[PDB]
């Protein structure tokens, strides 16, 4: 379960902290993980639970070199990773869903840094063949609310914005904008 | 085999783990109702240091409830005076075996058995005694706790609360070796090269703990760290070196590593 | 004449008392709230004068917190005995959220402008320094809350209060429009700290340059401004949704069971419809907000204002000085 | 080198005893006080001060001490940087009677700091004149008068170097606290205006026949420095990002507006 929420729900918060904010939803781990993250006494961890907050925050620092115990050390500690014949597949989508999002946690925070992109690099630093990442930047640019535009035959991408001071113009844009259009249900209670 | 344990802790419950709930239960029976000094006299001591040492052999589980015993015997006569029970303020070799001689054990155990938080507080333990017990002297040979504590304040805090702890022991040992008398060379040395050079290592902390919720009041977490090493803010970047080289701190130092 | 409302003027404060608030320095930690000082002046020429001020401490180890009024009897005979007074005509803070009359200090102020009505509240622009105007604020309570005060209702009782429409953007009086008198001694310094030497005029100086290029100062401002004031912003939001619920929707609900109930019945009184027919506990013109927080949006507007104006004379100096 | 040389005083302390001699302390020009602060071993750092007490005439000295332990047990609460230092008086520096006020300050342990404010008229005095004993041994008549004068290097802690400030501007012309950064605008044109003046005689003394030794490398270093920072160099890419930085903080300060005009709004619907 927390792994089929963390390979999902950190480039999801990840991009709310881009300011895609308005896909929080209640109930979700966020809430849970509060009673631990409020605690200063984060040593080492030695839980499952306490594993699976320090790979959450290694990813949400980008990193998939320090998540390689995390997906295999500590599964055999825990005497979860021998459950299961298909564990051999688990590990193949576990490092290509990591591969992929540790990019996009990478991706969502630095695009106020980004101007242009060698796809070179990525397959070097991801692991991830052409033909595959082709398809993985583009489904992100077709979806997820970027600036940025792909050139996969030159192998480049661009993206040249300015601004990175905007999280004031956005905050105050979502401050204002639940001003007028909560304003209104006043006036429908009135009427 | 999706839910079956391998075979040693199987024969171990057949015949061991009665014993081992008995050795718990035993010491759990007399230093409670009869052996403690909610009385006034027979030593307890001898055998309150040894339920740790019983949790490292046999089974850790028993450390979280032992704790908070020894820590509900503190609170029992710390300031209650319930009865004629041997005051902390003067009787040396009481007080000191209160403060000392079984909490050095407690952080021990805690950070060898990896129980970070219980080894917190147990530097709690015995700050809520340097809160409490102020009118006797400091205990004897006080370079015993800031030599000792710099290691689990490496990992539960930082390493620059480590460095700073390496700050706070070099200026109290400058003095101190007057009482703790040595002429011991490789000590002078030492002690410098590893609290200048251990300083730079790490600002960043970074808030990602925090941006996900709401603000809060959470500066406690910064003070409560330092309020241990009696600061009401944490320490302060390459100013901790220059408060260092102010000093013949920079020839003191070994000579392979002067000029850094 | 020059007078407001009531028999108090308007107020002046002498260079002697700013200095006295300035010696405190911004320094408590990133910031907790205290009353500073209590102000000491006289009815003279136009003004209430402002003579002089004594610190008022506080303990401050995390939170601030209170201790004996030992302190203040002491040190007010300590004003007095040199030559004769005790003439606490208001009280100041410089604490970090810029100008801000809170909720708290109008309480606080109710207690002490009803005790004593010729008295003021002061508050400087701290260290924060975004510096466009009005380094100095004063504020009145209005006589028209004074008339019903001993406290506000935690009940619909504050209605009978609140149809008397009273000022939340009350007028604050200008505190310096002419010399103090005791300009003079401080006059006879400026010869000799500027025309001999170099040494102790640019040490004044040089803080504007690096009010300028160093970190983040309108942008840690309209940073704070994108945290300070949208909370401000949703809870009236939420508060007014609950009470405009009661006020309508409820009623909405309750003039249809009372459709259903068909107004009343034959054979018995009418308690079915008198137990829902029960005023929900939140009135019309909830008071808090609509004086105490209003007091607030026009702090908040103004410093936005303050924010703004350091802002505009750069935009005018930054591309002219460069059109050369 | 023996002991203290320097006093670094601040405005606070002439404000105190300003605030002391003027109102009154029973003295008519002759008004006494008992300094605050601390010292570090060659410099005096002054705080803070308050007067206390007192009688002088010419066969009497009244220091009740007493009350600069009440006043120090205050002040102590008020910041902990104070300590009792020693005495300032007004109007003249010798006189066989303000040895008492040393009797009386010996009471008291340390190294005593005896400041005079001398309130004439010329500009041959200056405003506070600073001294403390030598030859202090073992117990003659009383105590000494050979003081050992003290210099002046000001410059104590940040905030109060602008409260003094808006006071000196105070003092030239009375002027309203809303306008305080335009004054600063309007008085920085001036500045390259009186610049402009000055530039000029430095240029006209080359320009006549011969002069500008006041100037050449120095004023040539002042200038091109000065162009180094305020504008910076000079592509046609810094005016766009210039212009761009502009328009950024203009949309910034509209945005203010537009948060104004909705803090508006809905407190006007609840008033409803």
Redesign the interface.
Known sequence: YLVSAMLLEIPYMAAHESDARRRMISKQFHHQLRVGERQPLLGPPESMREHVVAASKAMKMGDWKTCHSFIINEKMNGKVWDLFPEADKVRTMLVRKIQEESLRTYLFTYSSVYDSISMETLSDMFELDLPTVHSIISKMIINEELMASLDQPTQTVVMHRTEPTAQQNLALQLAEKLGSLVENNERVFDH | AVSGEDTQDRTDRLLLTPWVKFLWESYRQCLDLLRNNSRVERLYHDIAQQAFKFCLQYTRKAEFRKLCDNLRMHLSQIQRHHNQSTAINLNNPESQSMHLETRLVQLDSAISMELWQEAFKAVEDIHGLFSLSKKPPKPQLMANYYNKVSTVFWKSGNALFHASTLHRLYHLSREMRKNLTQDEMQRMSTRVLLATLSIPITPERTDIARLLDMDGIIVEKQRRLATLLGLQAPPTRIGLINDMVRFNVLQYVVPEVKDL | GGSGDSAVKQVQIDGLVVLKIIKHYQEEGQGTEVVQGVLLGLVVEDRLEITNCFPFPQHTEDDADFDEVQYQMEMMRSLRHVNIDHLHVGWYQSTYYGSFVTRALLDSQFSYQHAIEESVVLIYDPIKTAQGSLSLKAYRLTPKLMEVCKEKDFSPEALKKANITFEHMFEEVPIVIKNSHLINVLMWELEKKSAVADKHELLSLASSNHLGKNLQLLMDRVDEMSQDIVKYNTYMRNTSKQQQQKHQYQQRRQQENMQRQSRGEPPLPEEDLSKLFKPPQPPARMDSLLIAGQINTYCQNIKEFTAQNLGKLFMAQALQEYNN | FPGGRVVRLH??I???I?????????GAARVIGTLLGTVDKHSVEV??C????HNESEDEVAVDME?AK??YE?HK???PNELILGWYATGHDITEHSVLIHEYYSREAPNPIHLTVD?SLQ?GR??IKAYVSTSMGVPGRTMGVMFTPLTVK??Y????????????K???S?????????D??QV?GASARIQDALSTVLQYAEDVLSGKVSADNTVGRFLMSLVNQ???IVPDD??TM?????N??????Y??????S??????K???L
């Open positions: 405005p606070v002439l404000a105190s300003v605030d002391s001699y003027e109102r009154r302390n029973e705080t803070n308050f007067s206390v007490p009350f009440n006043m205050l609460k008020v910041s309130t500009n200056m405003s000001y410059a802690y940040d905030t109060e170097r602008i409260g003094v400030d808006l006071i000196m105070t003092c030239f009375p002027n309203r606290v809303i306008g305080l950064s335009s600063l605008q920085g305020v504008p910076k810094f005016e210039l212009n761009s930085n502009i950024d903080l203009l949309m910034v300060t945005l203010a507006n537009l948060t104004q909705q803090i508006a709004l809905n407190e619907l609840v008033n």
